[PDB]
Design a protein around this ligand. Structure first.
Ligand SMILES: Nc1ncnc2c1ncn2[C@@H]1O[C@H](COP(=O)(O)OP(=O)(O)OP(=O)(O)O)[C@@H](O)[C@H]1O
Ligand SMILES: Nc1ncnc2c1ncn2[C@@H]1O[C@H](COP(=O)(O)OP(=O)(O)O)[C@@H](O)[C@H]1O
Ligand SMILES: [Mg+2]
Lengths: 1063, 186, 682
């Protein structure tokens, strides 16, 4: 149980076992107890004895290695770490001289490691100046690099004395120079000497024998001469301030460096370091005093006051002159006494005050006294900024003047040295509590522009970042409107914040409110609870208002047709109240005062619960009627709003053409007249009568809102008498569907079952044709549409695929249909997961057990969620019909019949959809379109035919652009006279061509999930260009091609009357 | 391209799975990351002058002569500024590659930097003298021509900084300079 | 930015130049053209109303090399926004604006070629030594007493940067290594120890698994070989806690990067709360999961909290850098603009960057999972932080590993009971018996026990006590019926009797109120905030139990309040509830936070957020004389919901299982007596 388990008895080596024997203090006692008496070794076990034998053999091997030189150095150092245990075990195992052997071994290991340190130091010295001189280090450059796993025996410990190691030193001379570079490795002056001797060479490959002479020897001779000069004390101050310049007021390390100096030559060190280091310190302090006195004379000249010092003139006279001696002379000590122990710092303080004569002059010009500062800081606070730097500007100014008014305001034009020294002493005492005060003075001085524009500041138009929060808290009205203009419905354009005062008004948007929010979570803190309470209240009211906006758009896009005209004016003021309004003539205003935060949160609670119950009831209504399952929530809202009007918009009728086909307003009113009996009117009247009496039953707005939302949920037509509720919507859609005769019947192909979903893997190039092979097994029938065919794309809304699954699995439909989910693999992980959960739930609840659901996928993309979870329901056929069959099917189904008055008459026997292409461009594609246009103009005189031309030029070809370009073209019915569109496409559109072409041409639809629907009309011509994957897919549609003249002059015309007739 | 990929950390996305492709090559590593000219434009493109560098001297000659306002700057040193900038452009061309194919474009900007340095050329030289007097020998304490020093700064901004092989540029550019900075070391 | 202020510049050269105002828009792979367009609009707006010859704004795209291959192609309007500065308008002045496009990856040349690329290359050994010399220019003799290490270090770093395909290491690591050797050498004033170099090299070069970086750097410096062991816990403690002399001289320029802890199963917080947090308890800046909270408001408050912690000097433990990195990248850079001796980092939300103060002692700890950092972290963020690994085994020394294995065996035998009282062979996992057992729990409980002792000296005397205390921990959250059933268990007979005796005499589980009475009397271990979480099978408190608890507690409790997780849709509802609970006078308060895992709500992932928010409030509202007591109560079901319950969490949390919440006068409060007596003898 003490073996070194390493995930279960692996050893395959010997070093780990040796470590285990050496370190464990119980192997020692176990071995000693076993060796004392052999009556214990005879009875242990069969495996314990074998492991003991293995450990014994390992220790025997290492012990045998010890006597000779093959013992590895690492295990040797382990023994040098566990000397005691190894000695005891060796003494025990002697029974089956050592102290002298161990002592000699430790001595020779010390020699080895000291040589190792010496060669390391040599490499350090010769690589420190590597950029100046390059050295080839014999063989040691690679011998020192290898780790110490090499064998010991290479250390050649021989007698007849000298011990040669694997580091092949050229001579004992280089060994000694490396040793002395190790002893002097830690001197700054030695570093400077080495650098200055190395720069005396210059890109020269210089070897060690001439490194010793060219580099080391001059350095050492100069070092010796300097050491002798320092011992004598005959040095001059030019060399001193040249070399010791890097020893300013750091004298303990200087003393230690001089000790390292004196250890180089082995002599005594008693009475030389102290006085010489004191002389260096005195010289440094004299230079510092010279600099400080120069700065004082500068401020006396420049600040403005003449003063009278007349004491440092001899010092200045000495400063401009040069003397060459290294001794101390006594006549200046009494003069220097006054600044014997001033400081090393804080001359930065006086020199920063001195170099800024503009600040002091301006402060004396403007302030003139110390009592005005307290008013002045307050006056500057309002003029300052809002962030941390701007707020702390006034604080650093105030602290700077508080710490500098002693030597700034308490001075006389005639001062005596004693009182000036006392004032300076008090100044240092005051500065000691803020050692960054000179920085504060400089930072305030550099803000002289802001600080001169503070007294003369006029009315500044900048309210605050926090007083503005005060304004929002006092009178801010959060106004939700859901504007009805041409703008969108994003959470940015539905919420506004009106701030009154005069009678001017300012309207913050959510973007500007967010900007201010970022501004005032980062603003300074006054350590005052009022600021942070007020900002917290603003942030929370805005957060609950943002979440109300979130829920409101969630409910609008989920489709409520009752909150379309909802509006709310929250008064954030304490006990201001929240004021709701519905866009109706029968619903009163709902207002309640009190705390805004908690009651707003409760209101959002009821709003979200109403949203949940609304999703539940809309799901039930769709599961019942099955024709609210052709439009998602936004299209349902549009239809409901536009159905009650006497004339529905042409967009609504074109959308409804997907349920009925050739929809008309007369049929729409005929259906909507039979979708409600007088019992419904009586019920709504009863609700209207009972409603106010139950409203008056609750004091708070919570209960009244709850009851009003429950009544809108159950009985909605009473609330909004200009938009159909989901139930009336379903009745209208179902009656229109039943009125539409000849239901379509599409049978599933062979090998695909009409009661279980059919997953097919075909490959990206065959998904579109194979799906077609599913749909032409019932010829002479109209093509499918966005219903029953979902050309799925990356990031498709879960609601659309849920809608497809719903129309697949609801019983009341009047016709069997095949529902193909194409390219199901590019759906997102989450969209696919929710679609799968939705399919499971919807087949759990109820459906018709005859649905023909097919799921076509990319054969190379089985790794995603939907196909991986769909492996069991796979049909291993991959249906496919011959390509000419697809061509003939699409061509004869694109044929616009006669007596239709279409543009397609100009085409080849009326295909109404065509692709003009060429392998190389610049050939006549657009010219062919224009010649078809003029050929159509030749017929149908009084043409006035428009030619819309959408330029699709973007990467990741997008549907909404083409839909928006199409939208204002055929919602009017006056251009139902034959129209020639012209879709034009660029050569940077590689990633959207096939899905878009199949959607527009085959599916005959283009839909905005939150917008109207375009249906390709059977009778209006289309001409989509295409540049030249797509090569095969292009062939399905009826395609007419044009080739350059050199390619059309051998098989064939390729000419046009218009270009030739022009001059 | 190897230097670009070794610009510290490599490209965040590797060239194997990158999306900015023209054909099989990334548009990332092109000197011109210009998208493909669609057909009917390529059969109509045509090369302009390749800037054979014989007229480049006169182009930079004009560019400085206008954009410096040399009414009182120097009458002769427009020639030296013209020729040093043209020699710099010659070197930038004379590498079998150029950092941005920057002919006549770094020139209109380097003369602007030179004009900026010369309009300011009454204080920076002063602080330069103080800096090299407080910590350097008298060797770097010579009178600096406001027209030459500012030129050195313009060339060190627009050309010298954007190079990893600046030594060759310096030795090829100092041969076109007057006495004070006739050496690349200067 | 700090230097070339118009008239507030630091030197006469800079005063004569323009006035800089920068707006920083960090680029990310998921960037938008509208973001850079809005940043340009903001800088142009700042430019408007000023002098075009004296004031300039500058857009700064800090990571423009990340936004080159987004599907939306964000870096497209950058090329025009530098020549005319606006779109769909007549070109005009005040629209042109300065720009600095910093990047950590190579750029696309052409559309950015109007500017001049400073394509700074990987420095050679010459520039590495030169940068080392420049970094050590601050002092001089301690500069040259570490000069010898300059040549090898760089070389070693080179080999590291050569030996790995992924750029887990960069020049930040080398620079900060030089800085740490600086700081320790100038503090020592005597030289440099092998422990010093080994600590610096390991602390800076760490995190990655397939690198023996210490061995590589000791190959170039064989003299700097360390034979003693080095652990990660001390490395963390000396990253966070600095030295008394450090950061006490004129200005502070030597400091470590903001720390990262790499862990799996999100366990770092446990040990970090248990052993490291001493004296002052940090604030956890995390992604609150209260339902339908707004992410933008949450991160805004998070950044406000971290900024307050900078201004005060209190450590922050972030749990989120996928959304708090665009707002904290410049603060992680750890470069300050001094103003009166005070450090001001850049803090920004979106496009609004301002200089916020930072205290002398403010440490930032990121906590992240190994997989997500190794495949989703941007890479410069790795170099920006000081990677470390303390997951479960760095702090679990091998004898504690033996303890966790022994405890798992003893738990499996505690659960392994065969009894013939009832005719039923129902096998019990330790999940069923110990409520909240999830096969990683024994390591957690042994961690808790050793932290409860804290002596951590192996002199044959502490191992027994840690074993007993961990056993007490595992028993303290066990269902009472199995405690009675212990008789037929593999643990024998005497173990059952002693365990039940401790379970009813030393441990008080008869009543919640009795638990309070037994706890509040005794003095704690110098701890000024203590909280305990409770698991129950009985019904949660209704509202009439608080009154009876207060009546029985006229001198020990302080009129408690009870909150339910079902009613709390926001952080702030919880905030105001705990604030009203803390603002009232009186000491030894009591709060109960209720959450029922057996219901139709999603109130199961809100427990962590609720606990974190409560701890944050306790640490930001407590004075120095009031004591606090929080009792989170969760009710589980005996029908199998006591097995799915992830159990003993760490820190200032001690899971106890109380089967009966309120009281029961009918039954005696000792089931062992009912075991002794039969129905007839009753
Ligand atoms: N058969 C033709 N006879 C005379 N001119 C022709 C003929 N075909 C093309 N052209 C000329 O080609 C010119 C440009 O070609 P065109 O407009 O057809 O390009 P395209 O096919 O749309 O090109 P791209 O694919 O680049 O958009 C036109 O000015 C037109 O006059
Ligand atoms: N005929 C010419 N004479 C002199 N200079 C010219 C002439 N044509 C062009 N240039 C120079 O070309 C430069 C254009 O700079 P650059 O940006 O490189 O080219 P472009 O503006 O075409 O991108 C101008 O500075 C201008 O001095
Ligand atoms: Mg075309």
């Amino acid at each position: 149980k003490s073996w070194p388990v390493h995930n279960g008895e692996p050893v395959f080596d010997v070093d780990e076992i040796f470590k285990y024997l050496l370190k464990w203090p119980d192997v020692r006692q176990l071995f000693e107890l076993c060796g004392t008496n052999e009556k214990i070794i005879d009875n242990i076990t069969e495996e314990g004895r074998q492991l003991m034998a293995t450990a014994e053999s390992v220790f025997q091997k290492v012990a045998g290695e010890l006597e000779n030189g093959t013992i590895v150095v690492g295990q040797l150092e382990l023994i040098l770490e566990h000397q005691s245990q190894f000695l005891d075990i060796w003494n025990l195992n002697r029974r089956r001289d050592v102290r002298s052997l161990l002592k000699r071994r430790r001595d020779d290991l010390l020699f080895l490691k000291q040589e190792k340190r010496y060669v390391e130091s040599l490499l350090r010295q010769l690589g420190r100046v590597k950029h100046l001189v390059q050295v080839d280090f014999g063989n040691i450059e690679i011998i020192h690099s290898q780790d110490l796993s090499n064998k010991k025996l290479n250390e050649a410990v021989i007698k007849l004395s000298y011990k040669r190691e694997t580091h092949y030193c050229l001579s004992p001379d280089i060994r000694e120079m490396a040793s002395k570079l190790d002893s002097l490795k830690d001197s700054h002056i030695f570093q400077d000497f080495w650098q200055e001797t190395a720069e005396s060479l210059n890109e020269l490959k210089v070897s060690l024998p001439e490194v010793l002479e060219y580099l080391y020897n001059p350095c050492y001779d100069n070092f010796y001469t300097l050491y002798e000069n320092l011992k004598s004390g005959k040095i001059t101050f030019a060399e001193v301030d040249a070399i010791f310049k890097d020893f300013v007021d750091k004298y303990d390390e200087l003393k230690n460096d001089l000790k390292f100096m004196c250890t180089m030559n082995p002599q005594d060190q008693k009475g030389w370091i102290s006085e010489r280091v004191g002389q260096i310190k005195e010289y440094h302090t004299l230079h510092q005093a010279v600099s400080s006195a120069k700065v004082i004379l500068q401020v006396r000249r420049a600040l403005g006051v003449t003063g009278d010092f007349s004491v440092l003139n001899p010092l200045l006279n000495f400063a401009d002159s040069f003397e060459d001696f290294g001794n101390e002379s006594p006549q200046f000590i009494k003069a220097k006494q006054l600044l014997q122990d001033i400081s090393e710092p804080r001359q930065r303080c006086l020199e920063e005050l001195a170099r800024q004569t503009e600040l002091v002059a301006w402060l004396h010009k403007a302030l003139e006294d110390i009592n005005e500062l307290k008013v002045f800081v307050d006056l500057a606070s309002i003029s300052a900024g809002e962030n941390d730097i701007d707020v702390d500007r006034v604080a650093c100014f105030h602290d700077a003047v508080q710490g500098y008014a002693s030597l700034l305001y308490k001075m006389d034009e005639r001062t005596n040295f004693s009182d000036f020294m006392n004032h300076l002493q008090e100044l240092w005492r005051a500065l000691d509590n803020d050692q960054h005060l000179p920085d504060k003075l400089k930072d305030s001085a550099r803000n002289l522009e802001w600080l001169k524009t503070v007294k003369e500041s006029h009315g500044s138009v900048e309210l605050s970042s926090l007083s503005l929060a005060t304004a929002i808290n006092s009178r801010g009205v959060y106004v939700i409107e859901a504007p009805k203009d041409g703008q969108k419905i994003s959470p940015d354009t539905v919420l506004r914040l009106l701030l009154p005062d005069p009678e001017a008004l300012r309207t913050y948007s959510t973007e500007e409110l967010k900007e201010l929010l970022n501004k005032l979570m980062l603003m300074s803190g006054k350590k005052d609870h009022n600021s942070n309470t007020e900002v917290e209240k603003f942030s929370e009211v805005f957060s609950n208002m943002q979440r109300l906006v979130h829920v409101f758009i969630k409910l609008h896009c989920a489709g409520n047709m009752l909150f379309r005209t909802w509006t709310a004016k929250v008064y954030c003021c304490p006990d201001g109240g929240i004021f709701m309004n519905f866009g109706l003539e029968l619903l009163s205003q709902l207002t309640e005062k009190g705390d805004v935060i908690q009651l707003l949160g409760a209101l959002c609670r009821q709003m979200e619960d109403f949203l949940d119950n609304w999703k539940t009831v809309v799901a039930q209504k769709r599961a019942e009627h099955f024709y609210l399952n052709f439009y998602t929530a936004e299209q349902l809202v549009y239809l409901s709003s536009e159905l009650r009007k006497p004339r529905p918009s042409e967009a609504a009728l074109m959308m409804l053409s997907f349920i009925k086909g050739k929809c008309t307003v007369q049929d729409l009113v005929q259906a909507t007249s039979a979708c409600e009996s007088k019992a419904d009117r009586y019920c709504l009247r009863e609700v209207m009568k009972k409603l106010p009496q139950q409203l008056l039953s609750e004091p708070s707005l919570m209960g009244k809102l709850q009851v009003i939302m429950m009544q809108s949920l159950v009985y909605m037509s009473a609330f909004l008498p200009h938009c159909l509720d989901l139930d009336a919507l379903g009745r209208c859609l179902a009656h229109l569907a039943t009125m539409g005769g000849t239901p379509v019947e599409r049978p599933l192909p062979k090998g695909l079952q009409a009661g279980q979903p059919n997953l097919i893997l075909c490959g990206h190039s065959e998904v579109l044709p194979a799906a077609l092979a599913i749909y032409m097994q019932a010829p002479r029938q109209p093509l499918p549409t966005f219903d029953e065919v979902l050309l799925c794309t990356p990031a498709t809304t879960i609601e659309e695929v849920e809608l497809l699954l719903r129309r697949c699995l609801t019983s009341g439909s009047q016709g069997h249909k095949v529902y193909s989910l194409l390219f199901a693999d590019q759906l997102s992980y989450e969209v696919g997961c929710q679609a799968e959960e939705f399919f499971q739930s919807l087949c759990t609840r109820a459906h018709r057990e005859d649905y023909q659901l097919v799921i076509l996928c990319d054969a190379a993309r089985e790794h995603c969620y939907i196909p991986s979870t769909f492996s069991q329901y796979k049909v291993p056929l991959v249906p496919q019909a011959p390509l000419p069959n697809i061509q003939a099917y699409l061509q004869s189904h694109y044929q616009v019949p006669k007596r239709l008055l279409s543009a397609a008459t100009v085409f080849r026997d009326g295909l109404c959809v065509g692709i003009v292409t060429s392998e190389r461009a610049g050939v006549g594609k657009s010219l062919y379109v224009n010649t078809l246009h003029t050929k159509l103009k030749a017929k149908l005189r009084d043409e006035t035919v428009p030619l819309k031309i959408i330029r699709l030029t973007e990467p990741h070809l997008d549907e909404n652009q083409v839909l928006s370009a199409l939208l204002p073209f055929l919602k009017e019915k006056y251009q139902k006279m034959p129209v020639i569109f012209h879709i034009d496409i660029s050569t940077s559109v590689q990633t959207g061509i096939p899905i878009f072409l199949f959607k527009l041409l085959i599916l005959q639809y283009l839909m905005d999930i939150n917008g109207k629907i375009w249906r390709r009309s059977p009778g209006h011509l289309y001409l989509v260009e295409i540049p030249q994957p797509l090569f095969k897919f292009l062939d399905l549609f009826p395609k007419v091609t044009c080739r350059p003249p050199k390619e059309v002059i051998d098989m064939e015309p390729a000419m046009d009357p218009v270009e030739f007739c022009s001059e | 391209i190897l230097r670009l990929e070794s610009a510290g950390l490599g490209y965040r996305v590797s060239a194997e799975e990158t999306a900015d492709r023209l054909g099989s090559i990334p548009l990332r590593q092109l000197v011109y990351r210009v998208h493909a000219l669609p057909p009917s434009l390529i059969p109509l493109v045509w090369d302009f002058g390749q800037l054979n560098d014989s007229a480049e001297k006169l182009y930079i000659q004009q560019i400085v002569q206008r954009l410096v306002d040399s009414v009182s700057v120097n009458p002769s040193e427009t020639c030296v500024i013209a020729d040093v900038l043209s020699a710099s452009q010659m070197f930038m061309r004379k590498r079998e590659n150029e950092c941005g194919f920057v002919s006549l474009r770094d020139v209109e900007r380097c003369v602007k930097v030179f004009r900026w340095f010369h309009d300011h050329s009454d204080m920076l030289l002063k602080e330069l003298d103080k800096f090299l007097h407080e910590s350097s020998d008298s060797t770097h304490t010579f009178e600096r021509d406001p027209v030459l020093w500012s030129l050195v700064m313009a060339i060190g901004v627009c050309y010298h900084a954007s190079l990893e092989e600046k030594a060759s540029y310096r030795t090829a550019i100092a041969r076109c300079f007057p006495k004070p900075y006739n050496s690349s070391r200067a | 930015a700090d230097a070339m202020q118009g008239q507030a510049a630091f030197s006469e050269l800079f005063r004569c130049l323009k006035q800089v105002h920068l707006v920083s828009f960090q680029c990310s792979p998921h960037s938008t053209p509208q973001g850079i367009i809005s940043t340009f609009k903001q800088c142009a707006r700042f430019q408007q109303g000023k002098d075009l010859g004296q004031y300039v704004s500058v857009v700064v795209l800090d990571e423009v090399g990340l936004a080159e291959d987004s599907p939306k192609m964000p870096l497209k309007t950058l090329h025009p926004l530098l020549e005319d500065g606006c779109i769909e308008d007549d070109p005009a002045p005040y629209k042109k604006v300065g720009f600095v496009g910093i990047s950590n990856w190579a750029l696309d040349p052409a559309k950015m070629n109007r500017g001049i690329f400073v394509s700074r290359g990987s420095p050679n050994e010459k520039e590495l030594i030169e940068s080392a010399e420049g970094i050590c220019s601050s002092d001089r003799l301690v500069q040259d007493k570490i000069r010898g290490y300059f040549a090898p270090f760089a070389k070693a770093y080179e080999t590291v940067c050569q030996k790995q395909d992924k750029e887990f290491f960069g020049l930040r690591d080398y620079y900060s290594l030089i800085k740490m050797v600086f700081a320790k050498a100038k503090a020592s004033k005597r030289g440099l120890s092998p422990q010093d170099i080994t600590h610096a090299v390991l602390r800076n070069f760490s995190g990655k698994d397939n690198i023996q970086a210490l061995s590589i750097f000791t190959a170039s410096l064989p003299e700097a070989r360390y034979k003693e062991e080095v652990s990660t816990v001390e490395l963390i403690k000396q990253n966070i806690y600095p030295g008394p002399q450090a950061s006490s001289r004129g200005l502070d320029g030597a400091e470590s990067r903001y720390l990262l802890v790499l862990t799996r199963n999100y366990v770092a917080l446990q040990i970090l709360q248990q052993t490291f947090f001493e004296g002052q308890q940090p604030e956890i800046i995390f992604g609150s999961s209260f339902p339908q909270d707004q992410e933008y408001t949450q991160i805004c408050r998070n950044i406000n909290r971290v900024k307050i912690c900078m201004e005060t000097g209190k450590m922050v433990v972030l749990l989120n850098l996928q959304n708090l990195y665009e707002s904290l990248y410049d603060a992680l850079n750890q470069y300050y603009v001094y103003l009166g001796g005070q450090k001001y980092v850049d803090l920004g939300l979106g496009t609004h960057r301002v200089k916020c103060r930072v205290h002398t002692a403010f440490r930032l700890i990121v906590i992240e999972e190994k997989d997500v950092v190794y495949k989703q972290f941007p890479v410069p963020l790795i170099n920006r932080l000081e990677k470390h690994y303390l997951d479960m085994n760095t702090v679990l020394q091998p004898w504690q590993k033996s303890i966790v294995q022994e405890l798992q065996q003893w738990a499996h035998e505690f659960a392994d009971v065969k009894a013939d009282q009832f005719i039923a062979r129902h096998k019990y996992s330790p999940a069923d018996v110990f409520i909240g057992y999830h096969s990683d729990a024994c390591a957690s409980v042994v961690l808790q026990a050793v932290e409860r002792q804290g002596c951590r000296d192996l002199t044959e005397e502490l191992y027994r006590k840690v074993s007993e205390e961990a056993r007490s921990i595992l028993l303290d959250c066990a269902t009472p019926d199995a405690v009675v059933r212990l008789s037929g268990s593999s643990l024998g007979s005497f173990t059952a009797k002693q365990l039940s005796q401790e379970y009813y005499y030393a441990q008080q589980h008869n009543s919640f109120v009795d638990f309070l009475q037994a706890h509040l009397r005794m003095t704690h271990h110098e701890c000024r905030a203590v909280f305990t979480e409770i698991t129950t099978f009985s019904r949660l408190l209704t509202g009439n139990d608080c009154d009876v608890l207060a009546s029985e507690l006229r001198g020990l409790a302080s009129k408690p309040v009870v909150l339910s997780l079902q009613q709390y849709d926001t952080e702030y509802s919880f905030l105001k509830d705990v604030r009203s609970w803390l603002t009232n006078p009186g000491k030894r308060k009591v709060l109960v936070i209720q959450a029922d895992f057996d219901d139709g709500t999603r109130s199961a992932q809100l427990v962590a957020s609720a606990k974190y928010t409560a701890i944050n409030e306790i640490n930001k509202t407590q004075g120095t004389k009031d004591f606090v007591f929080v009792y989170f109560v969760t009710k589980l079901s005996r029908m199998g919901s006591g097995t799915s319950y992830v159990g003993f969490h760490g820190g200032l949390w001690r899971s106890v299982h109380i089967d009966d919440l309120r009281r029961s006068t009918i039954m005696a409060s000792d089931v062992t007596k009912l075991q002794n007596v039969t129905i007839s003898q009753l």
